[PDB]
Structure formats: structure tokens, C-alpha cells
Design a protein around this ligand. Structure first.
Ligand SMILES: *[C@@H]1O[C@H](CO)[C@@H](O[C@@H]2O[C@H](CO)[C@@H](O)[C@H](O)[C@H]2NC(C)=O)[C@H](O)[C@H]1NC(C)=O
Ligand SMILES: *[C@@H]1O[C@H](CO)[C@@H](O[C@@H]2O[C@H](CO)[C@@H](O)[C@H](O)[C@H]2NC(C)=O)[C@H](O)[C@H]1NC(C)=O
Ligand SMILES: *[C@@H]1O[C@H](CO)[C@@H](O[C@@H]2O[C@H](CO)[C@@H](O)[C@H](O)[C@H]2NC(C)=O)[C@H](O)[C@H]1NC(C)=O
Ligand SMILES: *[C@@H]1O[C@H](CO)[C@@H](O[C@@H]2O[C@H](CO)[C@@H](O)[C@H](O)[C@H]2NC(C)=O)[C@H](O)[C@H]1NC(C)=O
Ligand SMILES: *[C@@H]1O[C@H](CO)[C@@H](O[C@@H]2O[C@H](CO)[C@@H](O)[C@H](O)[C@H]2NC(C)=O)[C@H](O)[C@H]1NC(C)=O
Ligand SMILES: *[C@@H]1O[C@H](CO)[C@@H](O)[C@H](O)[C@H]1NC(C)=O
Ligand SMILES: *[C@@H]1O[C@H](CO)[C@@H](O)[C@H](O)[C@H]1NC(C)=O
Ligand SMILES: *[C@@H]1O[C@H](CO)[C@@H](O)[C@H](O)[C@H]1NC(C)=O
Ligand SMILES: *[C@@H]1O[C@H](CO)[C@@H](O)[C@H](O)[C@H]1NC(C)=O
Ligand SMILES: *[C@@H]1O[C@H](CO)[C@@H](O)[C@H](O)[C@H]1NC(C)=O
Ligand SMILES: *[C@@H]1O[C@H](CO)[C@@H](O)[C@H](O)[C@H]1NC(C)=O
Ligand SMILES: *[C@@H]1O[C@H](CO)[C@@H](O)[C@H](O)[C@H]1NC(C)=O
Ligand SMILES: *[C@@H]1O[C@H](CO)[C@@H](O)[C@H](O)[C@H]1NC(C)=O
Lengths: 172, 203, 280, 101
């Protein structure tokens, strides 16, 4: 259970657990690569405890535009919903969105194949994103599709070239 | 305009952050430099001012470093743009999906604030028909092949046609070249091929 | 990372002004542009094309590079080899990619299923079915080899392609250094993270590098002095890490733009650029 | 229009001597998209149709080299009416004098 602790003046916060780490009789503490204490021998009962982080993760608020709705959904990144409508993703615990079996194109991306959209009384749905419509190309060893007609597109592409010529007298 | 407008936004946000950082006190007693100087004699003021210098200089080094990396992005985009100017405006790009989706035709540059816009005119094919097709076509033992384009049939009759637009041309030694004989060609089809010369000599 | 779970430290990081928010922004732009890189590279195809049941490509054998339905995640054989060869608690995290590796493999399979069944055409129009023997006769024509040199050699070319695919499997199985590029990108990122973490062990002149030591030993008037050094050093390390990552992200973006260009010109097309798409 | 390049080394660099064709002595000509003969619009296979004024020629695009227009420099399509800016001419038959001979 997540607790504050103090062993002999070593303070910290974490989920203490029983551990398999075989300390030798002279050792009192074990350390992470970060120099933070990773395990301890309790000073009244000489068992070895892991010390592990109280769970954390970024609070990614999914929202349609305020020029549309004030309804919102929260991806708590990485965490399991047991620690926090509610849904679980490989990206984290997702709250206030509604999971949907149908696969739409990605609106707001959430991660690990999940995307969200505002849809039908409406709600924020979250779904496994469509990678576009699935299509059997009608291949056969003697079949060809030849276009009988065209469209002259005017696809428009919009490249940066300069950027605004700032300068700063660092003295000033 | 999301690209150019985001470049403007990014630069303005970088400046606005650099500007806000003048107000951040970096552990000095105040962030108004003239306030420190009007509060304190140099024995004291120099420590406070040196914290502000260290902070502001570090913030400036940060901003300039961000601007150098961003200038490298912008310059890579400018070289990309200059290449679309050179290959698509001044020329035609043979390079698939470089100048717009579809086969490229031409581009018209339109200036835009701190960027360029290209109107990439592109041919895109859009109404298919399915056809029976063959790699090559036997005439009398000789395997004929299309010079440009493809062989196809509606069902009862074989035609050569361009790759990129259906145009059934009757098959003739004008549009076909011979190679070897039938046997080596997996999937060859019979037909006949027109002799475009003999009916003139006959007439 | 700079102040983990100390309010006493987290206050002092606000006197250093906007820095944390723009570091988070910089790493967010890096993170977002990895999804952008991934979609610019792979998502060049608007529909998931899929292959037929019957694989009669004139003698060519893509079975090693197409997915196999036997797989738990539908990678190909060679994607499985590549995935076998190639190889944290301190406010550091790794966000997932937007596309899962199954989505990536479904896209590489779409690109590949287009490339097999439809030539370049799925880059321009809708994907047009075309027989694979006939597609290669165009690709011979597209390097000035008059295309009877394909069909009059069809079996021989099929066996050479098939065998050369087999040599890739053997090279990839035996030679772990072949993936040296990707393994170096992974190694560099891991080394940079291990360095970033190891800098938490460094005093920077403070009486310990573990922040709770200072706060358990010292009252605030003293501790502010010591914690300013840990803030300064950790922050300078974080700026260093983020700056290395921004420059590395530009290098990866250039590699992504290069990959996207080979995807466009050589998967979705055939490229006339000499030595751009392999020697030959 | 690029031809070839020679690399030459230089201190911390490279120098390329890019041999390029550049055209440089223009002549103006009357031109057309296509040429009507007997109902058919003939088009140039490669090059453009031009005339000095009174005689029509096909020439490759990047170096004025007048070629007399025949069935062999040209391809048919359709018939005249659809083509904006078509012009009349004759187009020579390289078989006809051999067939008469
Ligand atoms: C395939 O195309 C050919 C040529 O366009 C079609 O043949 C012509 O059919 C009309 C009658 O429908 C006749 O007046 C022409 O004389 C035919 N031309 C020749 C060369 O025979 C044919 O009908 C098409 N077949 C199918 C199954 O679509
Ligand atoms: C193409 O047509 C030829 C005839 O012009 C076919 O050849 C005949 O095939 C049968 C069966 O093998 C033989 O009994 C005859 O002796 C062959 N005749 C000649 C003159 O070779 C040929 O099979 C056809 N091939 C295809 C692919 O359609
Ligand atoms: C396509 O290639 C694969 C291997 O690249 C061939 O699969 C082998 O086929 C034999 C029987 O012919 C089996 O004993 C092997 O176990 C298969 N190997 C693997 C790894 O599955 C396949 O036969 C080839 N198919 C064609 C039509 O060429
Ligand atoms: C256009 O070019 C043609 C061919 O060079 C010129 O016709 C020749 O003119 C010379 C005298 O100037 C005659 O000796 C030839 O017999 C002509 N050849 C033919 C095929 O008729 C023509 O004069 C040129 N016209 C202009 C206006 O430049
Ligand atoms: C190309 O030449 C043909 C004749 O060889 C021209 O056709 C004649 O044009 C006049 C005026 O329009 C009509 O009164 C005749 O009835 C047409 N005859 C035929 C057979 O169509 C044609 O106009 C010429 N083209 C141009 C652009 O002048
Ligand atoms: C803790 O106290 C108990 C008696 O209350 C004693 O038996 C035990 O040995 C002590 N722990 C250690 C580490 O000696
Ligand atoms: C934003 O709201 C205005 C009305 O307040 C409306 O005209 C506009 O179409 C909306 N735009 C979007 C993207 O919803
Ligand atoms: C979520 O957490 C619980 C403990 O709270 C654990 O038993 C469960 O297996 C976890 N589920 C997943 C999929 O991680
Ligand atoms: C998803 O599909 C299953 C059937 O496969 C259905 O029972 C379930 O209720 C659906 N869930 C949602 C949230 O739509
Ligand atoms: C071509 O014909 C096949 C027949 O099975 C059909 O499945 C396919 O959809 C057709 N394609 C087009 C573009 O009409
Ligand atoms: C096409 O495939 C079928 C079996 O799927 C086979 O019978 C036929 O001979 C093949 N034809 C060509 C032209 O490859
Ligand atoms: C072409 O002819 C026109 C006649 O008005 C003239 O303006 C133009 O300069 C000429 N160009 C050349 C290269 O002779
Ligand atoms: C060229 O343009 C003029 C008007 O600018 C028009 O009167 C003339 O008929 C056109 N000629 C051709 C051959 O298109």
C-alpha cells in the first residue's frame, strides 16, 4: 500500500513489499542505478523489503473543441483503473469516454491504437482506430483494372521557407 | 494554413516565452533589474544581478538553441521547397508523391507569409474497367509485346492500350515488338496481330 | 525528475520560470513527431489493401515477407526476424506509439499487398490490380531493359528473387550487426536515458544527490542553497538531454523523410535516381 | 539540362563540375497542337510542329532540327473537330512512292 516511510532517517514514499532480494548479513540497504534506495532491511525484523513508486502518470485531457462542447474524457497514462464511465487501454486508464466496438478513422489520437471522437445525446467515444477501409485488391494472374478517365487534382501544399527574422541584442 | 500558421505561432510563442522569462526572478530578490539597482549597492547587487544574468543568459542560450534547431527545420523545408520550385514549377517531377498525390503535371507557387504554397496540379486516374490481360501475345510462333502500354481485352477482342488511360488501339506491328517464340513465356495468349503494310501492297 | 515529491523543491523550480513547461513542450513535439514520422512513412496508403487467398505471382515467393495467419501479431516471417534481432521510475516515462506494432505490420502489409498486386498505381489512383509477371515487365521497361528480358527469363528471375530473399533470412538470422542502425538508435536513446538517470547520482556540489537527504538533514534557509545546485545541475542535465534529443529527433526526422521518400519513390513507385534504392 | 559531372576534391569538401546543356539561340515559329491531314489529327511522337512561315516541320523540342512531316514522325488520333488550334497541312507517306515504284 502506498505510504510515507522513515527507516533510520532514510525518508521516502512508496509501496513497500516483501522481496526475493537475498541481502548478505552485513548489508542494510540496496540502491537503484539512480542512487535512490531500491530495497531495505527492516531495522526491527531483518526481512528485505522492496521500495517501489506510488503509481503515477500524465493526465491527458481529451476534448472536442469548446466551439462544440464542454464534455471531456481523461486518459490517465499507463495506470491500471484499480488505482485511480471507465475503460482500460494499453496507453492507460481512460475515464469519461465510452468504448465503442466500431472502428472509425482517428479523430483525437490517444495511443496504442486508441482514438476518440465526439458522436451520438452525444458522448466522447473511444475506439480502436481504422487504418482506412480494408480492401481486397482483386488480383488474378490475368486481371487488370485500367482507368478510363481522370480527374485533374489541384492538391495544395504549404511549406515554411523563411521564418520571421528575429534578432536580440543580448546586451540589451 | 496549419504549417505556416504553426511556424508563426511557434516563433511568437518562443519570443513570448523569452519575454516572460525577463519577469522570472531566477532566485534573485526581484526580476525588475532597475529595482535591484535602485535597492542595492554593488557589494550586494552584483550577486542578485549575477543570478539574473545567469538565468537570462541561460534562457537566451535556450531560445537561440531552439531557434538554431528550428532554423535547421525551416532550412530543410526551404531546400525542400526550392527543390519543388526547381523540379515542379521550373520542370515536371517524375518522382512519385513528391509534388502532390497522383502523377505530377505542374505547380504554381503562390507566396504566403513566411512560406510558399504550391498548387500541385496532378493527373489522378478515377474510373476503372476490369479486363482480361496477358504478358505478351503469340502471333505465328513469335511472341509480340506492347512497345508502350499494356495488352487487354473486353472479352471477345484484344487491344493494346496506354498504362494510365484506357484507349483501345487495334494490335499491329506498329505498337508491338517481337521477341523469340511463345514457349518460354508463362501465360502467353494467342491472338492475331495486324500487318499494317501488306493490305496496302495488296491494294 | 528535478524535484520528485518535494513541494520545497517544486516551489524553487517555479523561480527558474517557464523552463519545465517548454521542456515538456519540446519532448511533446518530439513525441508527437514520432507518430507523424510513422504516419508519413507508413500511412502513405489510404485503404488497407489485402492479398488474395491464391498467391500465384508467376513464380515469385513473397511468403517470407507477407504476413502469415499463424502469427499472434500478423508480422511477416522477415518482420519476425527483424523483431527478434533488435533488443524509468523518476518522472521519466515512455509513451506508446500511436500505431501498435500490429497496426504497423497491417500497414506494411497494405503497402506490400498494393506493391505486389497493383504496381505503382495505388500511389496515384485507386489500387489497380495487375498480374505480378506483367508488373515486373514494366519495371524492366522502367530501367531501359526491353521487357522480353523478363518473360524469356521468368523462372530464372523468380529463382534469383526467391533465393535472394532466402539469403536475407540467413544474413538476418546469423548477423546481429546487420540491424546496427536501429540497434544504435535504440542504444543511443537507452544510453542517453541511463545517462539522464545517472546524473541523479551526481552531487553538482550539493551535500547529497538524493533530494530527501537534504530535506531530512536541513531546514529551508540552508536547504535552498543545496537544492538550488541540484535543481541547476539536474536542469542543466535535462536541457542537455532534451537538446541531444531535439538534434537526434531532427536526424530521425531526416531519416523518416528519407524513408518516406523511398516509400513513395520505390514502394509506391520505381525510382530512376541512381543508387537511391539499392546498388544497381 | 544536366549531362554529367566530374568530382574534384577540396579541403573539407567536394567540387562538382556539372557539365550541362544550355540552349542559347532562339528562333520564333508558328506552331500548332496537332496537324489535320485526311480527317485525322496527326500529332508529333517526340518534338513539336513548327513552321518558319510557309512550310511545316516537326522538330525535337530542345534543338531546332526541321524534319519533313511523315506518318513515321507522327501518331494519329480521332479526327479534327475536337482539337482547339489544329492547323491543316499534308503529311507524307514514306511507303507511297515505293509502292508506286
Ligand atoms: C469488344 O470490343 C469490340 C471493338 O470495340 C467490339 O466489337 C465491335 O462490336 C460492334 C457491335 O457491338 C460491331 O459493329 C463492330 O464491327 C465490332 N468490331 C469488331 C472489330 O469486331 C465488341 O462488341 C466488344 N465485345 C464485348 C464482349 O464487349
Ligand atoms: C495457340 O494456338 C496454337 C495453334 O495456332 C496452339 O497450338 C496447337 O496446340 C495443340 C495442343 O497442344 C496441338 O495439338 C497442335 O499441334 C498445336 N498446333 C500448332 C500449329 O502448334 C497453341 O496450343 C495455342 N496456345 C495458347 C497458349 O493458346
Ligand atoms: C514459398 O517459399 C516457402 C519458404 O520460403 C516454401 O515453404 C516451404 O515449403 C516446403 C514444402 O515445399 C516445406 O517443407 C517447408 O517447411 C516450408 N518452409 C517454411 C519455412 O514454411 C513454399 O513451399 C514456397 N511456395 C511456393 C509456391 O513457391
Ligand atoms: C521554309 O523552309 C523551306 C525548306 O528549307 C524553304 O523552302 C525551300 O526554299 C528554297 C529557296 O529559298 C528552295 O531552293 C527549296 O526548293 C525550298 N524547298 C521546298 C521543300 O520547297 C522555305 O523557303 C522557307 N521559308 C521561309 C519563309 O523561311
Ligand atoms: C482544312 O482543309 C479542309 C478542306 O480540305 C477545310 O474544310 C472545308 O472548309 C470550308 C470552310 O469551313 C467548308 O465550306 C468546306 O465544306 C470544308 N470541306 C470539308 C471537306 O470539310 C477546313 O476548313 C480546313 N481547316 C482550317 C482550319 O481551315
Ligand atoms: C525488537 O524488540 C523485541 C522485544 O520487544 C525483541 O525480541 C527483538 O529482538 C527486537 N528487534 C531486534 C532487531 O533486536
Ligand atoms: C464555431 O462556432 C460558430 C458559432 O459560434 C460556428 O459558426 C462555426 O461553424 C463553429 N466552427 C466549428 C469548427 O465548429
Ligand atoms: C490491474 O490491477 C490489479 C490490482 O489492482 C491486478 O490484479 C490486475 O491483474 C491488473 N490488470 C492488468 C491488466 O494490469
Ligand atoms: C462489443 O461487442 C460485443 C460482441 O462481440 C458486445 O457483446 C458488447 O456489448 C460490445 N460492447 C460495446 C461497448 O459496444
Ligand atoms: C472487377 O471484377 C471483380 C470480379 O470478381 C470484382 O470483384 C471487382 O470489384 C471489379 N473491380 C472493379 C473496379 O469494377
Ligand atoms: C491462373 O491461375 C489458374 C489457377 O488459379 C491457372 O489454372 C491458370 O493456368 C493461370 N493462368 C495464367 C495465365 O497464369
Ligand atoms: C518573336 O517575335 C516577336 C514579334 O513581336 C518579338 O516580340 C520577340 O522579341 C521575338 N523573339 C525572338 C527571340 O526573336
Ligand atoms: C489565337 O487567339 C486569337 C485571339 O487571341 C484567336 O482569334 C485565334 O483564332 C486563335 N488561333 C488559334 C489557331 O487558336
Amino acid at each position: 500500500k502506498c505510504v510515507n516511510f522513515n527507516f533510520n532517517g532514510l525518508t521516502g514514499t512508496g509501496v513497500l513489499t516483501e522481496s526475493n532480494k537475498k541481502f548478505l548479513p552485513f548489508q542494510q540497504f540496496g540502491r537503484d542505478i539512480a542512487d535512490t534506495t531500491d530495497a531495505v532491511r527492516d531495522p526491527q525484523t531483518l526481512e528485505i523489503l522492496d521500495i517501489t513508486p506510488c503509481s503515477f502518470g500524465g493526465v491527458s485531457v481529451i476534448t472536442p473543441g469548446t466551439n462544440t462542447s464542454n464534455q471531456v474524457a481523461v486518459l490517465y497514462q499507463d495506470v491500471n483503473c484499480t488505482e485511480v464511465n471507465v475503460f482500460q487501454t494499453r496507453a492507460g486508464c481512460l475515464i469519461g469516454a465510452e468504448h465503442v466496438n466500431n472502428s472509425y478513422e482517428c479523430d483525437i489520437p490517444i495511443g496504442a491504437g486508441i482514438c476518440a471522437s465526439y458522436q451520438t445525446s452525444q458522448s466522447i467515444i473511444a475506439y480502436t482506430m481504422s487504418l482506412g477501409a480494408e480492401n481486397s485488391v482483386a488480383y488474378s494472374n490475368n486481371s487488370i483494372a485500367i482507368p478510363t478517365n481522370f480527374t485533374i487534382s489541384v492538391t495544395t501544399e504549404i511549406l515554411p521557407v523563411s521564418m520571421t527574422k528575429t534578432s536580440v541584442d543580448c546586451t540589451m | 494554413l496549419g504549417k505556416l500558421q504553426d511556424v508563426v505561432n511557434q516563433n511568437a510563442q518562443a519570443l513570448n516565452t523569452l519575454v516572460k522569462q525577463l519577469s522570472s526572478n531566477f532566485g534573485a530578490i526581484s526580476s525588475v533589474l532597475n529595482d535591484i539597482l535602485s535597492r542595492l549597492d554593488p557589494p550586494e547587487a552584483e550577486v542578485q544581478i549575477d543570478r539574473l544574468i545567469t538565468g537570462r543568459l541561460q534562457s537566451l542560450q535556450t531560445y537561440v538553441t531552439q531557434q538554431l534547431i528550428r532554423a535547421a527545420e525551416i532550412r530543410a523545408s526551404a531546400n525542400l521547397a526550392a527543390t519543388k520550385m526547381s523540379e515542379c514549377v521550373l520542370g515536371q517531377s517524375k518522382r512519385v508523391d513528391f509534388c502532390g498525390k497522383g502523377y505530377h503535371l505542374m505547380s504554381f507557387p503562390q507566396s504566403a507569409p513566411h512560406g510558399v504554397v504550391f498548387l500541385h496540379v496532378t493527373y489522378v486516374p478515377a474510373q476503372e474497367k476490369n479486363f482480361t490481360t496477358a504478358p505478351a501475345i503469340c502471333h505465328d510462333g513469335k511472341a509480340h509485346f506492347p512497345r508502350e502500354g499494356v495488352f487487354v481485352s473486353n472479352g471477345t477482342h484484344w487491344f493494346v492500350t496506354q498504362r494510365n488511360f484506357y484507349e483501345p488501339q487495334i494490335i499491329t506491328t506498329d505498337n508491338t515488338f517481337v521477341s523469340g517464340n511463345c514457349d518460354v513465356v508463362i501465360g502467353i495468349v494467342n491472338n492475331t496481330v495486324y500487318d499494317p503494310l501488306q493490305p496496302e501492297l495488296d491494294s | 525528475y528535478i524535484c520528485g515529491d518535494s513541494t520545497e523543491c517544486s516551489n524553487l523550480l517555479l523561480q527558474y520560470g517557464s523552463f519545465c513547461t517548454q521542456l515538456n513542450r519540446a519532448l511533446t513535439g518530439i513525441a508527437v513527431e514520432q507518430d507523424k514520422n510513422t504516419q508519413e512513412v507508413f500511412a502513405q496508403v489510404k485503404q488497407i489493401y489485402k492479398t488474395p487467398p491464391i498467391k500465384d505471382f508467376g513464380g515469385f515467393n513473397f511468403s517470407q515477407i507477407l504476413p502469415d495467419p499463424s502469427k499472434p501479431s500478423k508480422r511477416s516471417f522477415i518482420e519476425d526476424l527483424l523483431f527478434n534481432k533488435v533488443t524509468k521510475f523518476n518522472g521519466l516515462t515512455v509513451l506508446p506509439p500511436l500505431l501498435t506494432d500490429e497496426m504497423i505490420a497491417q500497414y506494411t502489409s497494405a503497402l506490400l499487398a498494393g506493391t505486389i498486386t497493383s504496381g505503382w498505381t495505388f500511389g496515384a489512383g485507386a489500387a489497380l490490380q495487375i498480374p505480378f509477371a506483367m508488373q515486373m515487365a514494366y519495371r524492366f521497361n522502367g530501367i531501359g531493359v526491353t521487357q522480353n528480358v523478363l518473360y524469356e527469363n521468368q523462372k530464372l528471375i523468380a529463382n534469383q528473387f526467391n533465393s535472394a530473399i532466402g539469403k536475407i533470412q540467413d544474413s538476418l538470422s546469423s548477423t546481429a550487426s546487420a540491424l546496427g542502425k536501429l540497434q544504435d538508435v535504440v542504444n543511443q536513446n537507452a544510453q542517453a536515458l541511463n545517462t539522464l538517470v545517472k546524473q541523479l547520482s551526481s552531487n553538482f556540489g550539493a551535500i547529497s544527490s538524493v533530494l530527501n537527504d537534504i530535506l531530512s538533514r536541513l531546514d529551508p534557509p540552508e536547504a535552498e542553497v543545496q537544492i538550488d545546485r541540484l535543481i541547476t545541475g539536474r536542469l542543466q542535465s535535462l536541457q542537455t538531454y532534451v537538446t541531444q534529443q531535439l538534434i537526434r529527433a531532427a536526424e530521425i526526422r531526416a531519416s523518416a523523410n528519407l524513408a518516406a521518400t523511398k516509400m513513395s519513390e520505390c514502394v509506391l513507385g520505381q525510382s530512376k535516381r541512381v543508387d537511391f534504392c539499392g546498388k544497381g
